[PDB]
Design an enzyme around this catalytic site. Structure first.
Site, short mmCIF file in Angstrom:
data_model
loop_
_atom_site.label_atom_id
_atom_site.label_comp_id
_atom_site.label_asym_id
_atom_site.label_seq_id
_atom_site.Cartn_x
_atom_site.Cartn_y
_atom_site.Cartn_z
N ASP A 50 0.84 -1.20 0.00
CA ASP A 50 0.00 0.00 0.00
C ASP A 50 0.88 1.25 0.00
O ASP A 50 2.05 1.24 0.42
CB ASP A 50 -0.85 0.10 1.28
CG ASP A 50 -1.87 -1.04 1.44
OD1 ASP A 50 -2.21 -1.72 0.44
OD2 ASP A 50 -2.37 -1.22 2.59
N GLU A 298 -14.07 -0.48 5.43
CA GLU A 298 -14.53 -0.63 4.05
C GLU A 298 -15.93 -1.20 4.06
O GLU A 298 -16.30 -1.96 4.96
CB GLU A 298 -13.61 -1.58 3.29
CG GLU A 298 -12.20 -1.00 3.08
CD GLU A 298 -11.18 -2.11 2.76
OE1 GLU A 298 -11.46 -3.30 3.04
OE2 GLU A 298 -10.10 -1.75 2.20
O1 LIG Z 1 -4.24 1.80 2.53
C1 LIG Z 1 -5.38 1.94 2.05
C2 LIG Z 1 -6.06 3.28 2.08
O2 LIG Z 1 -5.15 4.32 1.83
N1 LIG Z 1 -6.09 0.93 1.55
C3 LIG Z 1 -5.81 -0.45 1.90
C4 LIG Z 1 -6.66 -0.87 3.10
C5 LIG Z 1 -6.28 -0.12 4.37
O3 LIG Z 1 -4.88 -0.21 4.65
C6 LIG Z 1 -7.11 -0.59 5.56
O4 LIG Z 1 -8.50 -0.78 5.13
C7 LIG Z 1 -6.97 0.34 6.75
O5 LIG Z 1 -7.44 -0.26 7.96
O6 LIG Z 1 -6.53 -2.29 3.34
C8 LIG Z 1 -5.62 -3.11 2.58
O7 LIG Z 1 -4.33 -2.83 3.02
C9 LIG Z 1 -5.93 -4.55 3.03
O8 LIG Z 1 -6.44 -4.77 4.15
O9 LIG Z 1 -5.67 -5.48 2.32
C10 LIG Z 1 -5.71 -2.80 1.08
C11 LIG Z 1 -6.17 -1.38 0.75
O10 LIG Z 1 -5.68 -0.85 -0.49
#
Ligand SMILES: O=C(CO)N[C@H]1[C@H]([C@H](O)[C@H](O)CO)O[C@@](O)(C(=O)O)C[C@@H]1O
Ligand SMILES: [Ca+2]
Ligand SMILES: [Ca+2]
Length: 449
Positions: A50, A298
């Site tokens: 990320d 999410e």
């Molecule tokens: O880092 C972000 C938002 O900037 N998004 C990531 C999101 C966030 O880091 C996460 O929802 C924050 O708690 O999750 C992922 O890391 C995952 O759990 O697989 C993927 C996603 O792209």
């Protein structure tokens, strides 16, 4: 498989080397009113990590034959020098035929964990303008793409929508890079692009943070997958896009942003965490949330037969959480339901309305890893039943997860569903952590078998 059942062999719709990207994550999948499938994805150019530990661009592929063949793709957003766009979502305004894609954007060095507070915009005399900062910390504003100093003197600098920085009309850098003499605030920004030709061409990003991000939010990001356009009731036509944010203490709460004017203007609704009544009666708020357990992250939204919205949310309970809104996403009922029939291992999920009844019931289709880990990828058909009414008289709807089908043994993380023109279900899923992203078509005969 029973005779007539369809579950196509997986196609690696994105994979290392496609569009010269080594890695891919975060699928979104949508069938347009014209019948085209649009698939969007993060092209993660330096591994699977990320932001801020990467340089991530947005890629799109289109299918005009119901998902049997796909075009050669295109990159539609690309910022320089490790400024990333991450987590896309797709929706369309059926009245105008305009397709929307929204994404979270960070300047170089920034991501979920270190996003600064607020929108990155400042009000000058009634209009919000993007701030820029020089090496000494002095604050400038961008007004119709012209950079003004703190004393409202016009400078020699201008910008464009992509953040290029021009000195007397010559590009010198980009306000999202690690080297520009003027830089945007290091935080998250919601960006929007649109297509009026069924996904063939796309606008340049609009920065809508000034409308949807509050002063007390640190991260505010798209919840990836898809949005909805409300079909029934008093908010018919509203375009609804799932998001989530953190407060000053870093604690996460889900919400939706929405537009009643075909995407011209946006508003953020309350979170289900705002005035939420926890299991034993404690009342919390997303602004003050200070504990990890009630976080809601999410999410994806679906519409009940009368227009009522249901927000399905990633959370820390181990099980699916569902919030209900009677006012088109502006606020949520105080009770967030936990559905212990649906494991939720703290991962993105997909849920969509389905256009035909199943067993005499309105239905939704759901996809996530049915486990305590990112595995056992399972597509479910949930039948909607009314079980009485709330105190305000509104109908109370519950889901009966009657059909539950294992579609991906082993690794399964983020996913996105769509209904296809033939009434079947298309699914794009992370069947590897960050390399091949797989597309399949399934029919209901298969899903119910
Ligand atoms: O880092 C972000 C938002 O900037 N998004 C990531 C999101 C966030 O880091 C996460 O929802 C924050 O708690 O999750 C992922 O890391 C995952 O759990 O697989 C993927 C996603 O792209
Ligand atoms: Ca880039
Ligand atoms: Ca509430």
């Amino acid at each position: 498989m029973v005779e007539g059942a369809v579950k196509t062999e997986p196609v690696d719709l994105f994979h290392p080397g496609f569009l010269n990207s080594s890695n891919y994550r975060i699928p979104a999948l949508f069938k347009t009113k014209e019948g085209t499938l649009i698939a969007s994805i993060d092209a993660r150019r330096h591994g699977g990590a990320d932001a801020p530990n990467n340089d991530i661009d947005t890629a799109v592929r289109r299918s005009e034959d119901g998902g049997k063949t796909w075009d050669e793709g295109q990159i539609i957003m690309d910022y320089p020098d490790k400024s990333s766009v991450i987590d896309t979502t797709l929706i369309e305004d059926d009245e105008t035929g305009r397709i929307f894609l929204l994404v979270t954007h960070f300047p170089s060095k920034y991501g979920f964990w270190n996003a600064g507070l607020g929108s990155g915009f400042k009000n000058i005399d009634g209009k919000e303008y993007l701030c820029l900062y020089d090496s000494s910390g002095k604050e400038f504003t961008v007004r119709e793409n012209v950079v003004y100093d703190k004393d409202s003197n016009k400078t020699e600098y201008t910008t464009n929508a992509l953040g290029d920085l021009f000195r007397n009309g010559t590009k010198i850098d980009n306000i999202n890079s690690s080297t520009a003499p003027l830089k945007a605030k290091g935080t998250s920004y919601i960006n929007l692009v649109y297509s009026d030709d069924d996904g063939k061409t796309w606008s340049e990003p609009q920065n809508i943070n000034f409308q949807v991000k509050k002063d007390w939010m640190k991260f505010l990001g798209i919840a990836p997958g898809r949005g909805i356009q409300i079909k029934n009731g008093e908010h018919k036509g509203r375009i609804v896009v799932p998001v989530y944010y953190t407060n000053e203490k870093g604690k996460q709460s889900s919400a939706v942003i929405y537009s009643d004017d075909s995407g011209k203007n946006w508003t953020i609704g309350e979170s289900p965490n705002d005035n939420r009544k926890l299991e034993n009666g404690k009342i919390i708020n997303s602004k003050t949330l200070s504990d990890d357990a009630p976080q809601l992250t999410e999410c994806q939204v679906v519409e009940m037969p009368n227009g009522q919205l249901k927000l399905f949310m990633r959370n820390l309970s181990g099980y699916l959480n569902i919030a209900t809104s009677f006012d088109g996403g502006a606020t949520w009922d105080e009770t967030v339901e936990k559905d212990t029939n649906v494991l939720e291992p703290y991962c993105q999920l997909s849920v969509i309305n389905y256009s035909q009844k199943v067993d005499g019931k309105d239905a939704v289709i759901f996809s996530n890893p049915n486990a305590r880990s990112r595995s056992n990828g399972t597509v479910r058909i949930g039948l909607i039943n009314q079980v009485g009414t709330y105190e305000n008289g509104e109908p109370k709807y519950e889901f009966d997860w009657k059909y539950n089908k294992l579609v991906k043994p082993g690794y399964y993380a983020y996913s996105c569903l769509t209904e296809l023109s033939n009434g079947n279900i298309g699914l794009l899923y992370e069947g590897t952590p960050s390399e091949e992203m797989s597309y399949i078509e399934m029919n209901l005969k298969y899903l119910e078998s």
